[PDB]
Each structure stands twice: as structure tokens, then as C-alpha cells.
């Protein structure tokens, strides 16, 4: 399914992935399109950050839901 990701500035981008796709691959696709590194790229949904070892069905992501795409403060 496709998800609507919202960047810090409010930029809305749609990402096409599979239900059995892990968040890590989703990040990789975003790193392919926009070029945002999967490491600094922080995805928050429902108040919880999306881990790499998680699928779309893991967080029970709603079809075309609002995913928060932000960065990180502490690098180490």
C-alpha cells in the first residue's frame, strides 16, 4: 500500500511499498527518491518510532495514514 509521509516542513510525499516490506526498505526507497539517509531519517507514527525490523502490518498501519518524517538531534 501507499503511505503519506509528512516531513518537518509539512512536505507530503507518497511512498509505494508492499505490506511485507520492512521499514528499513521503506527508508531505502526514500533514500533513493529524496536521498534522505535511513540512519538520520526518523519515522514517527502514533507516537512511536518505526523500527527497521518491522513491517507495515507490524504497527497496523492504516491505508494512506500520516507518517511523520523528521530528523534526529543526538548523533551519538
Amino acid at each position: 500500500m501507499q503511505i503519506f509521509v509528512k516531513t518537518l516542513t509539512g512536505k507530503t510525499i507518497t511512498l509505494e511499498v508492499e505490506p511485507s516490506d520492512t521499514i528499513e526498505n521503506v527508508k531505502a526507497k526514500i533514500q533513493d527518491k529524496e536521498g534522505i539517509p535511513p540512519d538520520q531519517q526518523r519515522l514517527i507514527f502514533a507516537g512511536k518510532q518505526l523500527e527497521d525490523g518491522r513491517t507495515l502490518s507490524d504497527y497496523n498501519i492504516q491505508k494512506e495514514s500520516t507518517l511523520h518524517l523528521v530528523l534526529r538531534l543526538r548523533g551519538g
Binding site: 516542513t9 526518523r42 514517527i44 502514533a46 507516537g47 492504516q62 500520516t66 511523520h68 523528521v70 534526529r72
Partner: protein, 80 residues
């Protein structure tokens, strides 16, 4: 004109300068972070953080936006 409350953002019955919709959840409490033209990102964010009780992880997310509110990178961008 300082006659009508149009020159202010009335959120949840409270007047403030700027407000940011914290769409951290879908189908629940619509969090709205209030910011004034004389506050510091981390300070205002922290005030709201402990006002409606939010996890410190969201402090960074909200602070980042407030930082550029009066800076000029993606929001009020222009001449460097």
C-alpha cells in the same frame, strides 16, 4: 486592527502568536503547540511537553520546527 481576535490564534480557548498542529496521533487528542514571539524552542516545547504530558522524544521534533520559525532554512528562508 486590535478590535477583533483575528490577529491572534485562538486554540482551545487560548490566544497565542503561532501554533503548530502536532499530528502525532490519528483519532484522538489533537495536540497544538503554542509559541510566542519571545520564547525559546526548547523552553516553549518543554512547557507544552509537561503541559499535556508528552514523551521527551517529541521535544526534538517540535523544537526543530520552532528553530526555523525565526531562522530561515525552509520556513522563513531568504538571503543567507
Amino acid at each position: 486592527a486590535n478590535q477583533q481576535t483575528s490577529g491572534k490564534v485562538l486554540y482551545e480557548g487560548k490566544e497565542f502568536d503561532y501554533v503548530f498542529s502536532i499530528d502525532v496521533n490519528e483519532g484522538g487528542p489533537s495536540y497544538k503547540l503554542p509559541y510566542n514571539t519571545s520564547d525559546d524552542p526548547w523552553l516553549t516545547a518543554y512547557n507544552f511537553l509537561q503541559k499535556n504530558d508528552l514523551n521527551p522524544m517529541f521535544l526534538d521534533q517540535v523544537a526543530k520546527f520552532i528553530i526555523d520559525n525565526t531562522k530561515g532554512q525552509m520556513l522563513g528562508l531568504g538571503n543567507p
